Design a protein around this ligand. Structure first.
Ligand SMILES: Nc1ncnc2c1ncn2[C@@H]1O[C@H](COP(=O)(O)OP(=O)(O)OP(=O)(O)O)[C@@H](O)[C@H]1O
Length: 598
């Protein structure tokens, strides 16, 4: 009939959207489809990919590896994708180097990441030939801020490296199969390659899942990180043919970075190269003295380390990138970061090689069907952009009861705030039927709350820190809930946007799910986005960009609560006093909160 391959499995609520996304994508449009989390988007993605595939169209589905299992188990069973084929391209940028990442972990006191690497890089989240270990995505879960670019599995990492072996084994299975599953990072790396294993040079149909993340994947691909302690470690044992000049050039670079950071008004701002000319000598000489090192005789790892250092220095010298210094007075691990504030050329080079696309996420619209700022982040041409009506069923908000209690003190980052916020949080934790997730915006607030909250909650309380990551806190939260205690999670970062608080001991019983019963927003997440592209976007567009980004960081934070239909007795507290003030700048947020009733 008229139905697409796999529409029967697709949820009825998603059937209209699907159909729309089928037509425009066939036309050539880049479609913005937003359905609420828990609506069975994977079945829709499988149906779209199949409907494009049987026409002879080469189809690429770019999704995070953490949901690729669900996508393949939605795709494999339908006849059409079996007819055309379903392969999965695991390029090297999908894998970290265990040796260098362990090196980074011991230097940065990352106990959990080190333990993970020592255990074999086993997946944190449970067609696929071997078990996927050494994934960059899992390491990101264990360390939000790890320098992925200097830790990725390079092409010249030794053959005995477990990540290299696993990559080669997975490569031995890659066949051109019509439907190709890849990651966001792989997509961005391939686009960067083309702008200068691989995907088709032209993608007839591109389904991006969790598209709200794609931009980050591109940013990480155009980042470059110069880390000095491992570089010096490598140089000192490398040889004597050009060693001492390289060591002293690195020391000169370190001192110049120290001077530049000392002179800065604050260390967070990403200054351009012209703003800090002291680096121009050092970098250049560094580059030169990193080219004065003989290749033959070098260990397989030292080659990649030196080459990546040269790449980072050349990116910092190109003048097209914004730099960031972190040095000894503040940061023990000396780092020079270099990123692109404008990803327009690469994202264009992506969409120009795309016959049609469907971007799928639970958060693609600032308000209603407004995909303007998402369209700006992904640099979708306005000609091809097509926003479809969002799909947010009533079960996303009906179970949850919005609590009117709040902390009157404004979020001033002060102990005066902290004690009263802790008092209201204590009242919340007394009544919690299950887990409690207290979302904070800064580590300062997290540790401040932990100070005034640790005694009463005792073993319940779970702090998130640089030392204790979001994934480790998730594991502890689930384990504590299984044990009958009612944990409270002072979470931040990935807790806002990247954790699924669904009881997996209750898959077919959503009504009994109490893994997260009370979600508590301490304050509005204004200015949480730190991307270079966000700096540029805010500069160009004013405070509206800040308000919009904060609004959907807020939306994802609330999306922590309800994950599937059937849940009940969910409680939502938002303790930010500015919400209940009369200010107009909170009017978007109140709008969101107005969907939650009583
Ligand atoms: N029509 C349906 N009826 C019942 N269960 C369904 C239906 N469609 C999907 N499901 C199941 O519901 C669960 C939720 O699916 P999924 O995780 O893909 O949802 P999502 O949050 O919308 O999407 P994604 O994780 O891809 O962004 C899955 O186990 C899926 O198999």
């Amino acid at each position: 009939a008229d139905a697409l391959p796999g529409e029967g499995a697709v949820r009825e609520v998603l059937r209209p959207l699907l159909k729309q996304a089928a037509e425009k994508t066939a036309a050539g449009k880049i479609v913005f489809a937003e359905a609420a989390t828990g609506t069975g988007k994977g079945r829709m993605i499988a149906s779209l990919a199949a409907a494009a595939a049987i026409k002879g169209d080469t189809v690429v589905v770019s999704a995070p590896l953490a949901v690729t299992w669900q996508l393949v188990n939605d795709m494999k069973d339908i006849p059409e994708v079996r007819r055309v084929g379903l392969t999965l391209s695991l390029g090297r940028p999908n894998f970290i180097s265990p040796q260098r990442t362990l090196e980074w972990a011991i230097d940065n006191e990352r106990a959990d990441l080190a333990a993970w690497i020592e255990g074999g890089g086993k997946p944190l989240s449970l067609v696929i030939s071997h078990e996927l270990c050494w994934l960059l995505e899992d390491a990101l879960l264990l360390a939000e801020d790890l320098p992925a670019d200097s830790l990725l599995l390079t092409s010249e990492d030794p053959a005995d490296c477990p990540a290299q072996q696993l990559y080669v084994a997975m490569r031995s299975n890659y066949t051109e199969a019509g439907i190709i599953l890849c990651s966001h990072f792989m997509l961005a790396a391939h686009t960067r390659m083309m702008q200068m294993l691989s995907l088709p040079h032209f993608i007839d149909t591109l389904i991006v899942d969790e598209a709200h993340l794609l931009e980050q994947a591109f940013a990480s691909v155009y980042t470059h990180t110069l880390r000095l302690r491992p570089l010096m470690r490598t140089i000192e044992g490398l040889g004597s043919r050009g060693r001492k000049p390289a060591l002293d050039a690195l020391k000169e670079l370190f001192t110049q970075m120290q001077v530049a950071s000392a002179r800065s008004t604050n260390t967070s701002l990403n200054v351009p190269l012209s703003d800090v000319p002291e680096l121009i000598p050092a970098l250049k000489d560094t580059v030169k003295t990193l080219g004065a090192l003989p290749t033959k005789g070098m260990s397989r790892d030292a080659r990649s380390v030196i080459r990546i250092a040269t790449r980072a220095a050349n990116d910092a010298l190109s003048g097209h990138s914004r730099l960031r210094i972190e040095v000894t007075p503040v940061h023990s691990y000396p780092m020079l970061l270099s990123g692109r504030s404008n990803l327009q050329r690469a994202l264009l080079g992506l969409w120009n090689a795309t016959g049609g696309a469907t971007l799928v996420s639970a958060t693609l619209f600032t308000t209603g069907d407004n995909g303007s700022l998402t369209r700006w982040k992904l640099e979708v041409p306005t000609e091809r952009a097509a926003f479809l009506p969002p799909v947010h069923p009533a079960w996303t908000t009906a179970p949850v009861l919005l609590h009117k209690e709040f902390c009157a003190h404004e979020p001033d980052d002060s102990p005066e705030w902290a004690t009263e916020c802790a008092q209201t949080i204590q009242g919340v934790a007394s009544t919690a039927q299950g887990g409690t997730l207290v979302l904070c915006t800064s580590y300062q607030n997290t540790e401040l709350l932990a100070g005034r909250l640790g005694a009463a909650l005792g073993d319940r309380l779970i702090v998130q820190s640089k030392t204790s990551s979001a994934a480790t806190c998730l594991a502890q939260f689930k384990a504590k809930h299984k044990a009958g205690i009612r944990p409270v999670w002072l979470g931040l970062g990935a807790a806002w946007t990247g954790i699924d608080l669904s009881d997996h001991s209750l898959p077919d019983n959503p009504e009994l799910d109490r893994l997260l019963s009370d979600l508590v927003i301490t304050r509005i997440p204004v200015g949480q986005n730190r991307s270079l592209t966000h700096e540029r976007r805010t500069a160009i567009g004013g405070f509206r960009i800040i308000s919009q980004e904060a609004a959907w960081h807020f939306r994802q934070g609330l999306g922590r609560l309800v994950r599937r239909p059937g849940v009940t007795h969910k409680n939502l507290w938002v303790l930010d006093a500015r919400i209940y003030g009369g200010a107009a700048w909170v009017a978007p947020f109140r709008q969101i909160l107005d969907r939650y009733k009583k």
